[model samples]
Target: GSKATDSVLQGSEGNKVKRTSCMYGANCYRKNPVHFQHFSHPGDSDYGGVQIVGQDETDDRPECPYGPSCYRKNPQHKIEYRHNTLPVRNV
Candidate 1:
């Protein structure tokens, strides 16, 4: 049996995908290429190709004193180490 592809045209215009911010920012470690694309980061807003959106530049999270030179890439350090004052939707 063959089904029709009409559903492809279901939600036209009005459907706007929100662009979320990447919480990790420059310190992100995940390797999901698309993840960075779909969301934005502290270094880049709507920079991730994913096209997601989230306002976290004002998140009160503790900013990692260590910058990109954060050699301590351990779970213990990143547990609460926010690379920057931003956010993202990676789930």
Candidate 2:
């Protein structure tokens, strides 16, 4: 269902900061931190750019039934779906 958690690198090409969430969720395929910044993939706080997910809102959302195995990118899905807190490196 989801893209297997693998690799990502923001390396010099990355932006000053990552400030958004992606529809791709934990299964996000875009590895560039540049895009990663504009769109937050699941677990970005730990394995992605620094200073991310630095708030309580992350903890306030409802958990997704599919978790990391989810694949639906619907707008509705993006609004309330919260994957588990496992780091992206779990793969």
In the order shown, what is each candidate's alpha-carbon RMSD? 13.6, 13.9
lDDT of 1 by residue, 1-91 (tens): 5886543323321234634666565666775867655555554434443322243543445657874457785877766767653355675
Candidate 1, run of 10 with poorest lDDT: 6-15
TM match of model 2 to true structure: 0.28
Model 2: per-residue Cα lDDT over 8-74, one tens digit each: 6545435566456565556667687566656666565424333334223456677678876778778
Please count the clashing residue pairs in each candidate, in the order shown.
18, 2
Cα lDDT computed for each candidate against the true fold: 0.53, 0.59
Model 2's number of clashes is: 2
lDDT of 2 at 15: 56
Cα deviation of 21, candidate 1, in Å = 0.7
Off by over 4 Å in 2: 1-58, 88-91
